[PDB]
Amino acid sequence: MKFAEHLSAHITPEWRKQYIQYEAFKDMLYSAQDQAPSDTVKRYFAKFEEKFFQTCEKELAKINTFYSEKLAEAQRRFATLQNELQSSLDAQKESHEERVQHRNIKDLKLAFSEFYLSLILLQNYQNLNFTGFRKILKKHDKILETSRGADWRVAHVEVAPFYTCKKINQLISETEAVVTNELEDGDRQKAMKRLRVPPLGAAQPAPAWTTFRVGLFCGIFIVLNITLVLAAVFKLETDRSIWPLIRIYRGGFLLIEFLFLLGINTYGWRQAGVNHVLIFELNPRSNLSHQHLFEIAGFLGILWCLSLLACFFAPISVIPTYVYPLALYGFMVFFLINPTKTFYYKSRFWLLKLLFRVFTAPFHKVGFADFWLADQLNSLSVILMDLEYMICFYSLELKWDESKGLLPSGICHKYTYGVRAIVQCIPAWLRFIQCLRRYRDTKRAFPHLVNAGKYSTTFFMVTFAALYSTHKERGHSDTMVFFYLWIVFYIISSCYTLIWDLKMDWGLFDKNAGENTFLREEIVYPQKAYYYCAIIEDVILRFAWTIQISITSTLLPHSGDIIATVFAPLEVFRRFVWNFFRLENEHLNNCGAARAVRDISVAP
Amino acid sequence: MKFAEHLSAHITPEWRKQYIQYEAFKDMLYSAQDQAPSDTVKRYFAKFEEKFFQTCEKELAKINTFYSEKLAEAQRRFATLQNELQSSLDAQKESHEERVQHRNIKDLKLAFSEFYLSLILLQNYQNLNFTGFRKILKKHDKILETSRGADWRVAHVEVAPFYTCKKINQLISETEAVVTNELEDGDRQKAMKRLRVPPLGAAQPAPAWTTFRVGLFCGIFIVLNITLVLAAVFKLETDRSIWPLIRIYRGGFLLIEFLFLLGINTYGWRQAGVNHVLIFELNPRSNLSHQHLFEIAGFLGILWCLSLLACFFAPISVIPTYVYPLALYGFMVFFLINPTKTFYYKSRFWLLKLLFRVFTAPFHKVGFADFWLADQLNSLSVILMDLEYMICFYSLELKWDESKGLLPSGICHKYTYGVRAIVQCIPAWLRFIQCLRRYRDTKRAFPHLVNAGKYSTTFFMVTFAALYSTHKERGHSDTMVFFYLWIVFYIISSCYTLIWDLKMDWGLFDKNAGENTFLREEIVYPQKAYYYCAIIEDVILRFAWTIQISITSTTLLPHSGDIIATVFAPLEVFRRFVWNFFRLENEHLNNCGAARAVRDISVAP
Ligand SMILES: CCCCCCCCCCCCCCCCCC(=O)OC[C@H](COP(=O)(O)OCCN)OC(=O)CCCCCCCCCCCCCCCCC
Ligand SMILES: CCCCCCCCCCCCCCCCCC(=O)OC[C@H](COP(=O)(O)OCCN)OC(=O)CCCCCCCCCCCCCCCCC
Ligand SMILES: CCCCCCCCCCCCCCCCCC(=O)OC[C@H](COP(=O)(O)OCCN)OC(=O)CCCCCCCCCCCCCCCCC
Ligand SMILES: CCCCCCCCCCCCCCCCCC(=O)OC[C@H](COP(=O)(O)OCCN)OC(=O)CCCCCCCCCCCCCCCCC
Ligand SMILES: O=P(O)(O)O[C@H]1[C@H](OP(=O)(O)O)[C@@H](OP(=O)(O)O)[C@H](OP(=O)(O)O)[C@@H](OP(=O)(O)O)[C@H]1OP(=O)(O)O
Ligand SMILES: O=P(O)(O)O[C@H]1[C@H](OP(=O)(O)O)[C@@H](OP(=O)(O)O)[C@H](OP(=O)(O)O)[C@@H](OP(=O)(O)O)[C@H]1OP(=O)(O)O
Ligand SMILES: CC(C)CCC[C@@H](C)[C@H]1CC[C@H]2[C@@H]3CC=C4C[C@@H](OC(=O)CCC(=O)O)CC[C@]4(C)[C@H]3CC[C@]12C
Ligand SMILES: CC(C)CCC[C@@H](C)[C@H]1CC[C@H]2[C@@H]3CC=C4C[C@@H](OC(=O)CCC(=O)O)CC[C@]4(C)[C@H]3CC[C@]12C
Ligand SMILES: CCCCCCCCCCCCC/C=C\[C@@H](O)[C@H](COP(=O)(O)O)NC(=O)CCCCCCC
Ligand SMILES: CCCCCCCCCCCCC/C=C\[C@@H](O)[C@H](COP(=O)(O)O)NC(=O)CCCCCCC
Ligand SMILES: CC(C)CCC[C@@H](C)[C@H]1CC[C@H]2[C@@H]3CC=C4C[C@@H](O)CC[C@]4(C)[C@H]3CC[C@]12C
Ligand SMILES: CC(C)CCC[C@@H](C)[C@H]1CC[C@H]2[C@@H]3CC=C4C[C@@H](O)CC[C@]4(C)[C@H]3CC[C@]12C
Ligand SMILES: CCCCCCCCCCCCCCCC(=O)O
Ligand SMILES: CCCCCCCCCCCCCCCC(=O)O
């Protein structure tokens, strides 16, 4: 009985402007209703109804025009796939060929599945637009105490082509018949199981077992944290240090914070209307939810706390303390490379495939998902540097003869060899090479080659930073020279990233901006406070991340160690607030070509 | 798409036998389908269709007959309330009177709300019976590759009165119009808000915030429980005892186990179809779920663990250890008597009202809810005895001069005065007096006066136990005499309760047991293993609860008796839990015979 909310959750976000304006009409009715000349009123509503029915005529015209355009495109795509399949069967029947033709079959199958989803989306369009007309017209007659709404509906909407046409139904039946008599080789149970569209978007809930587990893992994590504070304030001794430890376990804290903050992004994208399932090309009918990410965050959270607490205590006296941390990372590695069909095997298979393509950048094309991860792995380098220290620490600074040799020179945590500089230039190198590939593939030097410059600036800042320090460590006479050259590149990079991420990424500061001062014309998120507040945060922390990478090759005192351990967490909160406005921008480009399905092509 | 599961969740459990048999029909179609005599098959399906369409004719006849009966009752109830309201308005307009007439208005309002719910239930009946006919007939034509199903539907079900009648709609509109023009004094927004029926039964879910909180409270409690074991094995000392402690905190463990096991009952009753909302008379459109009980169990669980862990440790050195336990029970008491409109205020208001009526038994009538609680409070007496010891302990054995005087003679935990006997005969006395009232009100000595006998037997067993233990305590020559008289009453009670609850409560061992040997003719729960297994448990633990009330009279001098009591109080709870299933089920099978899916609300003259 709450249609407003029903339509607000059952609308294709890309076509949000082709759907009847229910709330505006309600405002109109309750406006003319709350305000009246209480002959004066007789002529007053003789003018309000004119406007009301006038607006209704325009809205019905829009739905009929939008409906006609989509049906034409549907007939075209149908003819397109029909020929490809006929040609494919003609080629296979007329005929390395098997493997390519196998994909050819797989390509044709994804094409017909994607086409069916589009026909269902168009059917649900007409169904929810007719329900809105009837429910609002009843509110009009019920508010104006008249019978004109009934007259209007029976003579206009009830005859409207958007509500009278009967070709989408035939097209849907034609496709399912072809998919069953051509691809499935005769099985409607398999064909329908493939072409059937379940509830999608923000109109489908999650299992209560997922909500329960999510909450359970969280509650254990909260208690195992208060314990680590007290135990860290009592059982620990001052005779030994806590830095080799803070160094290895700091990495795990960042990865868990990433998965937790990433689930809060999936939630905001879903409730705002940003179709991240089309931007990242994820199965439209089978995809994970914010709850599944919150669940994996809690699981690895408890695993981390128990390992560190077993290090503060001595649960076992036959087990060397330098095995708890090794088992934790060994476990996390297996949970991601499990060759069994369990624990989100399909979701993990996607991540394992993407990572490979993003670590072989120059040999593969770049899609939003591929480049987006490399920008995610460009804010998760502290994890790579922590892993770096751990490897050398257990190889050069670890006394296995001493069972308690895990927690006690520093060459493993220093860029004495540049290992903490080249490793710091791994994620930037991936994005630099991925950009050049895009340029070669697009033949456009803007923005493919201008952006490849934003990634190079880091190489210089990291290099000069490591050189000035080493020369100064040898007391050479090139200490101030490198120091000045270094600080120069630092400020250059800090601004070549802030501008490109507040202009070429978010897309704010638009010539076409009316009331949203310094903001794009159309903003998806609800409040304008979010955009203005995030702009301040990106600036404040864009000049505090170039310093956290220049202290990887400089801060002799443990003071610099505190700085690094206090910044790695804040950098994560920057990629988190930057994951909102980046995806939103990409969505506002699909809401212009009205693209609610992907464009799947077949192989010749 | 899954109609079978849509029917079995959207069916009024009382009328479950008036609804089309969808699964049987599917079995028939897929049976004749899996078994094809591959002329032979031409005549084979010429005989299968005959049977299939024959069964369809009978089912449609049943739905039309059941539908006709309910509509007649609806017209009568409508005329009944109509006259009462007319008379009520005529009396008020024609006229202590204000407060009785206020109730009179409230009585008329609940009557029209309950009537509306009945009309909606009857509308949903016709709607789900026509959907089943169409969905099965399509499966028949789709399985037999014929068009007979379509012909059958258009010429029979499409014309059937259960699908053609249009009077329920008029009745529903008539009632809402009367409730708005008579009671609300003109406001359809208030009238509809009162007479509107939301999703009810096993077809409505719970908020994910409830599932999350439930899980969160559980996780903290589990960790706080592993911490009590390790702390109880390290920080604790042997110089002092742990019995005054086990005595006070044992009571809280039982109450939390009750609320947790009770939520698992609400779950089983809802998924089996036992309408506990009609048996207990709870708002049909606003009632708590198993999740809300699991949530309160976890909350009080953490509160208990933290209090006992603060006693093993010394979180504060200015706070005497004998205040953690006092704050816990003080808090639980407030959470139940909160005068604010928060934390289930409505649900708590019902429990507070029922408890009062069940503690003033002789002055009020007895309903399933009232008598059922007194039987719930008859298995929660260890909590009363623990509360008893604690009070005397903090009054006669507590050294406040010693800040650490909470954990260290025993006269507070002994029946030296009979306090552990009269207190042990409080819940049985309530049930005894409630039964006699029923007899006076029913004038029937069976089963009202035979039942009052099962409750008296306890009075004797506890008494003689004390006589033998107290005479023996003064080494009198009447030690063996009382001991023999005592053991006699013990076995008498152990069997006068097992039989009554195996034949007069559960209702098993029926002349009409058929395939269900030693079980009633119709069993609601899915497996027959549950009934047989529970019978064994009620016996094994019906002869182990009479002993846990005979060790409350200076009998087991050694701490072994203390161990016995602390190990039985938990098992007794698991008996009332397995007895809460078959008792409510029995009451339901009595409503599934008169087809009563709404309560009968009367008005005041
Ligand atoms: C999922 C639900 C929740 C799971 C919870 C898991 C258990 C957590 C238990 C935490 C208990 C800590 C606080 C203990 C309070 C009471 C005891 C106390 O205060 O004394 C400290 C106690 C005894 O000390 P002591 O006798 O000196 O120990 C000798 C060991 N050689 O010290 C002890 O001996 C207590 C040792 C507790 C160790 C708990 C941490 C995990 C232990 C096993 C290793 C698991 C992690 C493995 C990591 C691999 C990588 C993932
Ligand atoms: C190699 C080391 C590099 C250093 C960093 C550590 C490794 C990377 C850590 C982050 C991993 C990626 C997390 C986010 C990726 C997903 C992004 C997204 O929004 O996509 C969601 C989507 C779920 O829907 P999906 O099932 O994929 O739908 C189509 C399926 N065909 O797809 C997904 O959800 C895909 C992701 C699967 C579910 C989450 C996986 C959690 C485990 C990640 C590995 C953690 C351990 C790394 C190694 C040890 C490090 C100490
Ligand atoms: C809801 C989410 C979860 C909530 C968790 C709440 C906190 C739980 C913390 C449990 C910690 C116990 C184990 C501690 C492990 C590390 C320290 C250790 O092993 O040593 C014991 C430690 C120090 O002992 P010590 O220094 O002798 O104390 C002096 C006091 N005069 O001993 C201590 O000093 C530790 C004391 C811990 C006390 C925790 C229990 C609650 C304390 C406040 C009272 C709350 C309950 C109030 C009850 C009222 C009725 C409801
Ligand atoms: C006086 C002391 C005697 C010794 C024992 C302790 C007190 C009694 C403990 C048990 C309390 C009753 C628990 C079960 C009662 C409910 C039974 C049931 O299935 O009914 C469910 C129903 C919920 O639906 P409802 O909202 O009532 O629908 C109509 C509303 N008009 O109605 C309800 O849910 C009603 C119950 C409200 C919700 C649960 C209340 C939990 C708190 C109970 C008190 C606990 C503390 C007692 C005092 C301290 C003891 C240490
Ligand atoms: O009963 P429904 O068919 O579901 O219709 C209801 C109902 O309208 P009707 O009484 O005309 O049926 C509500 O009105 P009241 O019953 O409370 O008088 C109305 O609320 P409004 O009067 O405020 O419009 C509500 O709509 P909503 O909940 O959005 O306010 C609307 O449900 P629909 O929106 O689905 O028509
Ligand atoms: O698509 P629907 O209208 O929701 O109907 C489906 C569908 O039947 P139709 O194809 O005739 O529509 C299923 O059959 P397939 O598509 O898989 O061939 C059928 O399953 P069965 O063939 O096994 O009967 C299923 O019913 P169910 O899920 O109970 O098996 C039934 O949905 P309904 O039960 O709601 O008619
Ligand atoms: C000051 C020195 C050391 C470094 C200079 C690099 C960056 C700090 C700044 C300087 C000028 C900026 C550029 C000025 C103008 C433009 C064009 C502007 O064009 C668009 O809006 C393109 C939109 C589209 O392609 O969709 C995008 C941002 C960009 C490249 C800016 C990106 C960031 C730049 C390169
Ligand atoms: C064993 C000695 C020490 C005590 C005797 C009392 C109980 C142990 C037993 C003896 C005979 C039993 C009765 C034998 C037969 C019946 C009739 C039987 O009839 C019904 O089914 C009544 C149903 C109804 O009234 O609704 C119900 C149980 C009852 C009363 C039994 C209840 C339990 C009784 C009283
Ligand atoms: C490293 C730590 C691991 C912890 C490991 C646990 C991570 C989750 C912590 C709590 C937040 C998620 C669970 C909270 C509530 C969810 O049930 C709802 C479901 O949607 P609904 O409210 O519309 O039914 N989710 C939300 O409301 C949105 C997400 C809430 C985010 C809260 C931000 C703090
Ligand atoms: C004193 C202790 C306090 C603990 C305090 C926590 C008490 C709850 C413990 C766990 C059981 C309840 C929560 C488990 C799952 C629920 O989400 C589902 C919801 O129904 P669904 O599965 O159909 O979606 N409930 C059930 O499946 C039925 C109840 C499960 C009972 C489990 C018995 C152990
Ligand atoms: C200087 C500091 C305080 C700036 C803080 C900026 C943070 C708090 C702002 C910037 C962007 C904001 C987010 C922008 C978008 C959404 C999606 C919306 O559906 C929920 C709120 C949420 C999730 C906002 C949360 C608060 C937010 C993260
Ligand atoms: C001797 C001992 C082992 C006997 C144990 C008896 C117990 C375990 C049996 C007896 C009655 C049984 C219950 C009977 C009814 C239901 C409702 C059903 O929907 C879920 C199972 C459930 C909840 C059963 C659980 C197991 C049960 C509690
Ligand atoms: C750097 C530390 C990060 C962890 C601390 C929390 C950071 C994320 C906070 C998100 C706040 C906004 C959440 C919106 C939720 C909602 O709208 O329901
Ligand atoms: C005496 C201790 C009692 C507590 C231990 C658990 C007792 C209840 C066990 C219930 C088991 C059956 C639960 C059925 C759940 C389901 O069917 O989904």
Side-chain angles (χ1 to χ4, degrees), chain B residues 257 260-261 264 267 570-571 574 577:
Chain B
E257 180 190 2
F260 174 60
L261 286 177
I264 305 164
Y267 171 59
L571 290 171
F574 187 66
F577 152 68

PDB file of all heavy atoms in Angstrom, chain B residues 257 260-261 264 267 570-571 574 577, ligand 14:
ATOM      1  N   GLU B 257      17.811 -19.945  30.597  1.00  0.00           N
ATOM      2  CA  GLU B 257      17.604 -21.211  29.843  1.00  0.00           C
ATOM      3  C   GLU B 257      16.122 -21.323  29.482  1.00  0.00           C
ATOM      4  O   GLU B 257      15.826 -21.811  28.378  1.00  0.00           O
ATOM      5  CB  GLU B 257      18.059 -22.412  30.669  1.00  0.00           C
ATOM      6  CG  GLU B 257      17.870 -23.742  29.964  1.00  0.00           C
ATOM      7  CD  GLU B 257      18.081 -24.961  30.846  1.00  0.00           C
ATOM      8  OE1 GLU B 257      18.341 -24.778  32.048  1.00  0.00           O
ATOM      9  OE2 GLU B 257      17.989 -26.088  30.326  1.00  0.00           O
ATOM     10  N   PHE B 260      15.320 -18.940  26.526  1.00  0.00           N
ATOM     11  CA  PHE B 260      15.990 -19.478  25.315  1.00  0.00           C
ATOM     12  C   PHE B 260      15.227 -20.691  24.780  1.00  0.00           C
ATOM     13  O   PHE B 260      14.942 -20.731  23.574  1.00  0.00           O
ATOM     14  CB  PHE B 260      17.429 -19.883  25.619  1.00  0.00           C
ATOM     15  CG  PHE B 260      18.127 -20.581  24.478  1.00  0.00           C
ATOM     16  CD1 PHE B 260      18.294 -19.952  23.256  1.00  0.00           C
ATOM     17  CD2 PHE B 260      18.608 -21.873  24.627  1.00  0.00           C
ATOM     18  CE1 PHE B 260      18.933 -20.596  22.209  1.00  0.00           C
ATOM     19  CE2 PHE B 260      19.244 -22.515  23.577  1.00  0.00           C
ATOM     20  CZ  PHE B 260      19.406 -21.877  22.371  1.00  0.00           C
ATOM     21  N   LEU B 261      14.895 -21.650  25.644  1.00  0.00           N
ATOM     22  CA  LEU B 261      14.177 -22.887  25.239  1.00  0.00           C
ATOM     23  C   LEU B 261      12.741 -22.531  24.842  1.00  0.00           C
ATOM     24  O   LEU B 261      12.176 -23.254  24.002  1.00  0.00           O
ATOM     25  CB  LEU B 261      14.222 -23.876  26.407  1.00  0.00           C
ATOM     26  CG  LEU B 261      15.565 -24.557  26.647  1.00  0.00           C
ATOM     27  CD1 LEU B 261      15.505 -25.446  27.878  1.00  0.00           C
ATOM     28  CD2 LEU B 261      15.986 -25.363  25.430  1.00  0.00           C
ATOM     29  N   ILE B 264      12.547 -21.438  21.239  1.00  0.00           N
ATOM     30  CA  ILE B 264      12.655 -22.630  20.348  1.00  0.00           C
ATOM     31  C   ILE B 264      11.280 -23.302  20.287  1.00  0.00           C
ATOM     32  O   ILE B 264      11.022 -24.008  19.291  1.00  0.00           O
ATOM     33  CB  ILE B 264      13.757 -23.589  20.830  1.00  0.00           C
ATOM     34  CG1 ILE B 264      15.104 -22.876  20.967  1.00  0.00           C
ATOM     35  CG2 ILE B 264      13.854 -24.801  19.916  1.00  0.00           C
ATOM     36  CD1 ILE B 264      16.125 -23.640  21.773  1.00  0.00           C
ATOM     37  N   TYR B 267       9.109 -21.177  17.855  1.00  0.00           N
ATOM     38  CA  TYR B 267       9.569 -21.531  16.493  1.00  0.00           C
ATOM     39  C   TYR B 267       8.875 -22.809  16.019  1.00  0.00           C
ATOM     40  O   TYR B 267       8.326 -22.785  14.908  1.00  0.00           O
ATOM     41  CB  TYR B 267      11.086 -21.709  16.476  1.00  0.00           C
ATOM     42  CG  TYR B 267      11.625 -22.270  15.186  1.00  0.00           C
ATOM     43  CD1 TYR B 267      11.420 -21.610  13.986  1.00  0.00           C
ATOM     44  CD2 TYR B 267      12.330 -23.460  15.160  1.00  0.00           C
ATOM     45  CE1 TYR B 267      11.905 -22.115  12.794  1.00  0.00           C
ATOM     46  CE2 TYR B 267      12.821 -23.981  13.974  1.00  0.00           C
ATOM     47  CZ  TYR B 267      12.608 -23.306  12.787  1.00  0.00           C
ATOM     48  OH  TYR B 267      13.090 -23.806  11.603  1.00  0.00           O
ATOM     49  N   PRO B 570      18.549 -27.769  35.963  1.00  0.00           N
ATOM     50  CA  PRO B 570      18.626 -27.622  34.506  1.00  0.00           C
ATOM     51  C   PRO B 570      17.803 -28.656  33.724  1.00  0.00           C
ATOM     52  O   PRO B 570      17.165 -28.262  32.763  1.00  0.00           O
ATOM     53  CB  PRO B 570      20.112 -27.851  34.204  1.00  0.00           C
ATOM     54  CG  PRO B 570      20.809 -27.526  35.496  1.00  0.00           C
ATOM     55  CD  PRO B 570      19.861 -28.042  36.553  1.00  0.00           C
ATOM     56  N   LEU B 571      17.820 -29.927  34.135  1.00  0.00           N
ATOM     57  CA  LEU B 571      17.112 -31.029  33.424  1.00  0.00           C
ATOM     58  C   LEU B 571      15.593 -30.862  33.538  1.00  0.00           C
ATOM     59  O   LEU B 571      14.903 -31.187  32.556  1.00  0.00           O
ATOM     60  CB  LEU B 571      17.560 -32.359  34.029  1.00  0.00           C
ATOM     61  CG  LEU B 571      19.000 -32.763  33.728  1.00  0.00           C
ATOM     62  CD1 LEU B 571      19.402 -33.970  34.558  1.00  0.00           C
ATOM     63  CD2 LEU B 571      19.183 -33.048  32.247  1.00  0.00           C
ATOM     64  N   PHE B 574      14.226 -28.778  30.808  1.00  0.00           N
ATOM     65  CA  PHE B 574      14.148 -29.499  29.513  1.00  0.00           C
ATOM     66  C   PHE B 574      12.914 -30.402  29.475  1.00  0.00           C
ATOM     67  O   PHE B 574      12.567 -30.888  28.387  1.00  0.00           O
ATOM     68  CB  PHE B 574      15.398 -30.347  29.303  1.00  0.00           C
ATOM     69  CG  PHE B 574      15.500 -31.005  27.951  1.00  0.00           C
ATOM     70  CD1 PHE B 574      15.644 -30.250  26.801  1.00  0.00           C
ATOM     71  CD2 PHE B 574      15.439 -32.384  27.825  1.00  0.00           C
ATOM     72  CE1 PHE B 574      15.738 -30.854  25.558  1.00  0.00           C
ATOM     73  CE2 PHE B 574      15.530 -32.989  26.582  1.00  0.00           C
ATOM     74  CZ  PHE B 574      15.678 -32.223  25.451  1.00  0.00           C
ATOM     75  N   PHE B 577       9.976 -28.039  28.644  1.00  0.00           N
ATOM     76  CA  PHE B 577      10.207 -27.614  27.241  1.00  0.00           C
ATOM     77  C   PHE B 577       9.614 -28.648  26.282  1.00  0.00           C
ATOM     78  O   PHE B 577       8.938 -28.229  25.328  1.00  0.00           O
ATOM     79  CB  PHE B 577      11.707 -27.450  26.989  1.00  0.00           C
ATOM     80  CG  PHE B 577      12.158 -27.677  25.570  1.00  0.00           C
ATOM     81  CD1 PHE B 577      11.801 -26.801  24.560  1.00  0.00           C
ATOM     82  CD2 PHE B 577      12.942 -28.773  25.245  1.00  0.00           C
ATOM     83  CE1 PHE B 577      12.222 -27.011  23.257  1.00  0.00           C
ATOM     84  CE2 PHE B 577      13.357 -28.985  23.941  1.00  0.00           C
ATOM     85  CZ  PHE B 577      12.996 -28.105  22.950  1.00  0.00           C
TER      86      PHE B 577
HETATM   87  C1  LIG C  14      18.819 -29.203  29.621  1.00  0.00           C
HETATM   88  C2  LIG C  14      19.633 -28.394  28.643  1.00  0.00           C
HETATM   89  C3  LIG C  14      18.800 -27.701  27.601  1.00  0.00           C
HETATM   90  C4  LIG C  14      19.602 -26.942  26.573  1.00  0.00           C
HETATM   91  C5  LIG C  14      20.166 -27.802  25.469  1.00  0.00           C
HETATM   92  C6  LIG C  14      19.328 -27.823  24.214  1.00  0.00           C
HETATM   93  C7  LIG C  14      17.906 -28.265  24.427  1.00  0.00           C
HETATM   94  C8  LIG C  14      17.003 -28.025  23.250  1.00  0.00           C
HETATM   95  C9  LIG C  14      17.407 -28.778  22.018  1.00  0.00           C
HETATM   96  C10 LIG C  14      16.445 -28.645  20.876  1.00  0.00           C
HETATM   97  C11 LIG C  14      16.778 -29.522  19.705  1.00  0.00           C
HETATM   98  C12 LIG C  14      15.788 -29.440  18.583  1.00  0.00           C
HETATM   99  C13 LIG C  14      15.723 -28.094  17.920  1.00  0.00           C
HETATM  100  C14 LIG C  14      14.942 -28.092  16.623  1.00  0.00           C
HETATM  101  C15 LIG C  14      15.393 -27.019  15.686  1.00  0.00           C
HETATM  102  C16 LIG C  14      14.892 -27.179  14.260  1.00  0.00           C
HETATM  103  O1  LIG C  14      14.109 -28.116  14.012  1.00  0.00           O
HETATM  104  O2  LIG C  14      15.285 -26.361  13.406  1.00  0.00           O
END
